[PDB]
Every structure is written in structure tokens, then in C-alpha cells.
Amino acid sequence: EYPTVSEIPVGEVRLYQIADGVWSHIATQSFDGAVYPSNGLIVRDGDELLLIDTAWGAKNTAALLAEIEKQIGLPVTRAVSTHFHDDRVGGVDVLRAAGVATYASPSTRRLAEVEGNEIPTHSLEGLSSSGDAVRFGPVELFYPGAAHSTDNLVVYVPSASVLYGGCAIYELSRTSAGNVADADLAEWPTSIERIQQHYPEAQFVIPGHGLPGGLDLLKHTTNVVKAHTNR
Ligand SMILES: CCCCCc1sc(N)nc1C(=O)O
Ligand SMILES: [Zn+2]
Ligand SMILES: [Zn+2]
């Protein structure tokens, strides 16, 4: 069963196998007086691993590398952060120190530098416009336009029909927004629709926080974003 927030002490990381060569990583951390779970992705890349997003901070990300080495045993050689917040780049220095080459779009790297957060080393090109898609080893990166943030990317694993929505996609059980301080509540339902248009074949959808589901998470997220807007 997928691990839930109360089952992961802060400082520990779980790995969950979604498909052959595709895992999520689950960590926990505090934000604004409560502890929350957070998801990332791991994708087999030949004899190497591609990491999508940190485990939300340095200590969690060090434990992420430790669990990978113990359960999977292949090196993490590249990481992509899907937007500029600490649940996505917090830990990038640990990854750098351990030998991982880190990547994000130029906007993300600048919005993170601006904001005092850690900065991925390398700029992803070809994603500066809503609708853009680029290949990056075993995955596709896709910019849907602004949503949870203006820079947020989603990630698709063709091999497996896995869509990783990051923090632009909410889990089913979530009925209220926040954090929306950096969101575009205007563009957000549209960006969700662009995602629906590009990956209608998606069998597995991973939100940035919470339990995986199907493409129904896209419709559900739109409702929540709009319900917050009309209130
Ligand atoms: C649906 C979010 C639940 C809690 C709020 C938080 S905490 C964190 N690191 N990210 C978020 C986010 O909204 O993406
Ligand atoms: Zn965020
Ligand atoms: Zn988040």
C-alpha cells in the first residue's frame, strides 16, 4: 500500500514501485506548523537512474540517496527539479556533493536563486513556452503553462504511461488549496487542460503530494482550484 504521511518520520524516505524501472519517492517535512508528505520520481536510465525532484531538504535527500543505493543499487547521475520551491530543489547541494548533475529550466533556476533556495547547475532548454515538450533520457518534460507556479513542469514516462504532475496536480482526497502564494489561479485550469490534451494515454498520475490516481486527478484538481477562486 502507498505510504501515508503518518507512517514516514521526518528524515526517512520510502520508495514505491509504480512499474518496471519506475518508482516514486515519498518524504515528509514541516510547512507552516504541520508535516506533509511529498512525492518525487525515479526512472531507470540504462545502467543509471534519473531522479525527478529532491526529497524536500538536505537531510531527506541524503536519506533518499541512501535508500536508493540499498534497494536499487544503481547510481543517480542526473536530477531534474520541476519548480523552484524547497520540496523540489531543497537537497540539490547534497545531490551535487554526491556526484549528481542537476537540471532545471532557466526560469526555475532564476526563481530559486532570487528566493534564497538551492540552484540546479544546468539549464533545460526548449521549455520556455506553454505546450513545449523536450526529451530527457527515458522521460518527456512538458511545460503546461502557469499553475501551482509559473515555472512548473510535468514529467511523463512513455515506457509506462506514468504522468508525474508535481504540485500542479492535487490528490483526490484534497478539497482545499494552499499553498497558492505563487500560483496563477487564472491560467491553472487551462494548464490542466493542456496536460489532458498531451497525455490522454496516461494510466498512472502522481500528484506532488499524496496518493497516486488516474487522469481523474486532473479534473478534480481543476474543481479545487476553481472552488478556491469563487470564494
Ligand atoms: C496540496 C499541498 C498540501 C500542503 C501545502 C504544501 S507543503 C509543500 N512543500 N508543498 C505544498 C504544495 O501545495 O505544493
Ligand atoms: Zn511548490
Ligand atoms: Zn509542493
- 37 neighbors 28 (Cβ within 8 angstroms): yes
Q: Active-site residue 198, yes or no?
A: no
Q: How far is the CA of 167 from the centre of ligand 3 (A)?
A: 5
Catalytic residue among 39, 53, 85, 151: 85
How many Cα neighbours within 13 Å face the side chain of 172? 8
Minimum-distance ligand 1 atom for the alpha carbon of 207: 1
Q: Which of 58, 10, 38, 63 is nearest to 166 (CA)?
A: 38
The C-alpha torsion from 81 through 85 and 90 to 96, rounded to 10°, is 40
Cβ-count burial of 129 within 10 angstroms (0-12 exposed, 13-18 middle, 19+ buried)?
exposed
The stretches of the chain forming alpha helices (DSSP H) are 58-71, 86-89, 92-98, 106-114, 188-198, 216-229
Which ligand is in closest contact with the Cα of 85? 2
Is 85 catalytic? The answer is yes
Residue 134 CA to residue 119 CA, distance in Å, equals: 21
Q: What is the domain count for the chain? A: 1
Q: In what order do the strands lie in the sheet with 48-52?
A: 14-19, 22-31, 34-45, 48-52, 76-80, 101-104, 122-123
HSE-CB for 223 with a 13 A CA cutoff: 11
CA torsion sign, 92 to 178 to 114 to 141? positive
Segments forming the whole domain that contains residue 224: 5-230
Pocket test for ligand 1, best of 5, 31, 85, 185 (most atoms within 8 A of CB): 31
This entry's atomic model was obtained through: X-ray
Q: Is 60 a catalytic residue?
A: no
Dist CA 203 CA 121 (whole Å): 32
What Rg do the C-alpha atoms of the chain give, in angstroms? 16
CA distance 190 to 149: 13
Q: In this structure, what CATH number is given to the domain that contains residue 106? A: 3.60.15.10
Of ligand 1's atoms, which has the minimum distance to the CA of residue 85? 9
Question: Of the candidates 151, 172, 171, 154, which has an alpha carbon nearest to the alpha carbon of residue 163?
Answer: 154
CA of 149 to the centre of ligand 2 (A): 7
Q: Strand 162-166 vs strand 76-80: parallel, antiparallel, or unpaired?
A: unpaired
Our answer to whether residue 148 is catalytic in this structure is: yes
